[PDB]
Amino acid sequence: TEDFIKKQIEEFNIGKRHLANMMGEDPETFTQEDIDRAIAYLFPSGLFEKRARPVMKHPEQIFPRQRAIQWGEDGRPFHYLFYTGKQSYYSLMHDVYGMLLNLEKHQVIGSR
Amino acid sequence: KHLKFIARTVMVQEGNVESAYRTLNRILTMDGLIEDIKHRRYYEKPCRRRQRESYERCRRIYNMEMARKINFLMRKNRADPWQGC
């Protein structure tokens, strides 16, 4: 839940400070890359699957971005296309269609 | 008893015998004479003939209705005017 995510964020901040203390670096300038290097040094793992090695990333990345329930206490969903079951995809399609309509109003090499 | 070289007669145009024969065969087929001869080679019993005629009539009616339906529905076979919705 959202409160669980807040608790995880607080725990991650405290752990980041503790890891900066352990590695003897400034907690205020301890980037995510420093966190990863410190974790790899303190908890070495030769497992080939990188997703299986120890990780202490931000909760925004460790937890799936599917988020908690998509409605508040009142139960009203936040997104107006929620009942489509694919609110992200259909919102993206709606935005693209609006862009095409605006293009109608007004009027390959290094990418895949 | 009738006068000859009038019925089922096609004049050959510039020696094109094959085209004249094709025209004559098409005329006979359009008039159903070829199918008449093929059916008259052996006796078709009246019940069998009635069944065949009824089946042919039903098949023609169904084919005409299906053709009309396909022609009516193919008017919508165009580019999607509301793509992305």
From Swiss-Prot, chain A:
Transmembrane segments: none annotated. It is found in: Mitochondrion. It comes from the Eukaryota. Component of the mitochondrial small ribosomal subunit (mt-SSU). Mature mammalian 55S mitochondrial ribosomes consist of a small (28S) and a large (39S) subunit. The 28S small subunit contains a 12S ribosomal RNA (12S mt-rRNA) and 30 different proteins. The 39S large subunit contains a 16S rRNA (16S mt-rRNA), a copy of mitochondrial valine transfer RNA (mt-tRNA(Val)), which plays an integral structural role, and 52 different proteins. Belongs to the universal ribosomal protein uS9 family. This is Small ribosomal subunit protein uS9m. It comes from Homo sapiens (Human). The lineage of its organism: Eukaryota, Metazoa, Chordata, Craniata, Vertebrata. The gene is MRPS9.
Swiss-Prot record, chain B:
InterPro entries: Ribosomal_bS21, Ribosomal_bS21_sf. One of its GO terms (molecular function) is RNA binding. Pfam families: Ribosomal_S21. The keyword Oxidoreductase does not apply. It is found in: Mitochondrion. Gene3D superfamilies: Ribosomal protein S8. Keywords: Mitochondrion, Ribonucleoprotein, Ribosomal protein. Its main location: mitochondrion. GO terms for cellular component: mitochondrial inner membrane; mitochondrial small ribosomal subunit; mitochondrion. It comes from the Eukaryota. GO terms for biological process: mitochondrial translation; translation. PANTHER family: MITOCHONDRIAL 28S RIBOSOMAL PROTEIN S21, SMALL RIBOSOMAL SUBUNIT PROTEIN BS21M. Belongs to the bacterial ribosomal protein bS21 family. Component of the mitochondrial small ribosomal subunit (mt-SSU). Mature mammalian 55S mitochondrial ribosomes consist of a small (28S) and a large (39S) subunit. The 28S small subunit contains a 12S ribosomal RNA (12S mt-rRNA) and 30 different proteins. The 39S large subunit contains a 16S rRNA (16S mt-rRNA), a copy of mitochondrial valine transfer RNA (mt-tRNA(Val)), which plays an integral structural role, and 52 different proteins. This is Small ribosomal subunit protein bS21m.
